[PDB]
Design a protein around this ligand. Sequence first.
Ligand SMILES: [Ca+2]
Ligand SMILES: [Ca+2]
Ligand SMILES: [Ca+2]
Lengths: 137, 135
Amino acid sequence: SMSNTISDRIVARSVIEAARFIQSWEDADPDSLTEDQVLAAAGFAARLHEGLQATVLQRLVDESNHEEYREFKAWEEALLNADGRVASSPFADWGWWYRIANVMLATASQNVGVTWGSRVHGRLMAIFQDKFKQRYE
Amino acid sequence: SMSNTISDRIVARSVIEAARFIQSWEDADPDSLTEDQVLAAAGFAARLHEGLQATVLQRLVDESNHEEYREFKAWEEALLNADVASSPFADWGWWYRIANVMLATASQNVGVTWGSRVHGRLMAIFQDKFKQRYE
Ligand SMILES: [Ca+2]
Ligand SMILES: [Ca+2]
Ligand SMILES: [Ca+2]
């Protein structure tokens, strides 16, 4: 398939934060971010986090849709590896926040055609470590 | 099933235009719009049009999904009726449905109370800005 419906649904309910992040980080130097670039990244990640947590906890999914249900379960697995039911490692590779950083990279790719890499992604993860350590126990 | 995947896909690729529209219109008086408010609405609608036309022509839908395909067919019919007896600005036509997407986007992001007054103002903008595509 050529779709990522869960990401589209969450980004589509996060457009103000998404636009603020993309526009703030346009020519950003991840090695020397401004306070406003940090805040725009944290604000978008927090909005994505809120929507994704709601989708997982409330089971906002069609379990009969083979693709959507599997992709939901990957988000659910990431949440369980953050909230202690399976593990308490929210910042592990390919875990909850790593996947949110990936959605933020996707947002830039699909809106303005820019492809960020490790320097941006690692800086996002460091911001999340600084700001969101208390979002899980 | 209850889903908005066709519009979500495009809105998630239109976040700059979508945010500009929402933030421009949060204090908007549809009876006395600023020029920037007009441009913000037209810019989001034109972006939605581009993505929706691509969706129809490329058939970007799971046609085995009963509801997603029903919605797709309604977009496809609206596009056919817009290209004479074409009525691109008719009730429940192409641009009317785009105005619906714009109100849905505002509601799902910031919780607006907008209704028929805003929708009718958008339709007047769209007829003024886009009519030459059908002449
Ligand atoms: Ca997918
Ligand atoms: Ca399928
Ligand atoms: Ca729907």
